[PDB]
Amino acid sequence: MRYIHSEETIPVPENLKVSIKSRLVTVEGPRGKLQKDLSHIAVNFSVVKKGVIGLEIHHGSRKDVAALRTVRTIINNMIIGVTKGFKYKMRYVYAHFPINVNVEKNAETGCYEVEIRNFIGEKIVRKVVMAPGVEVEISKAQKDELILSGNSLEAVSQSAADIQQICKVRNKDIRKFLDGIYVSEKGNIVE
Amino acid sequence: ALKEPPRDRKKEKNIKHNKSVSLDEIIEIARTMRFKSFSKDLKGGVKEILGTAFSVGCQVDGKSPKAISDAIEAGEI
């Protein structure tokens, strides 16, 4: 079973610009610019209407057509991200031993780095380098919050996963020792 | 308020299923107090309701409250 024609459309708001060349997408708007390369997928791009982009695959199989929506949702996420940004929230959870962190400022480059001390009462100092373009803040709204913000969802989420994955308990029952840092809510910078 | 005569004092620790009551116009007369509180049109539905309400008692003798309510053959009042 080979499918003749499968098509979807993406609207574009009247605020930003997008240009595609040789399967390389450039999106630039009020909050910056992003680049992505999609040369590994055979897709045909076209301009359906004044503000609608269409893309399609011809004579594809079910497995090939399955990947068609993935680019659509990635491009939509980039469109949202370049006009509204992204924001993740994190909480610290300890029972007895407090954990203290220090998100020091730029280290002579755009990258931020986070220092974590006193995890389950350990004297190890553990060092993490954030992806470029992501801003880390200690919240002042109320206590025990870590604020992550940025332009790209992939970098914001991966950096959050780095923070989550670096605080691990070893040789203990993790159903009893619930210590660690976890993400609790994801959203946009505006509203 | 029937319960097959007075329930002797402290005679409820064991089974207390001896609450059989007669099935007659007495229940229909007692239904007039409710007077079809929740709609029931001209109270024919309320009459069937109250008649089948004592489903544990199984009406009187062979007749059953469910059979009596299901069979629409009695007078309205």
Binding site: R91, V93, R175, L178, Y182, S184 | -
Partner: protein
């Protein structure tokens, strides 16, 4: 002590999971088939029993 909402938040990542019966792999709570290849994508799963 841990306040209940934080305890639930932390437990959601390490208590509510499915366990494969062939390779002891951790699966999402609503999974129906194991994802690992050494067991052949088996559908013999059991819930992770809680601690009490």
């Amino acid at each position: 002590i841990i306040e209940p909402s934080l305890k639930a938040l932390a437990s959601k990542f390490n208590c509510d999971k499915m366990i494969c019966r062939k390779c002891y792999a951790r699966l999402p709570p609503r999974a129906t088939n194991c994802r690992k290849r050494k067991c052949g994508h088996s559908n013999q799963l059991r819930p992770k029993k809680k601690l009490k």
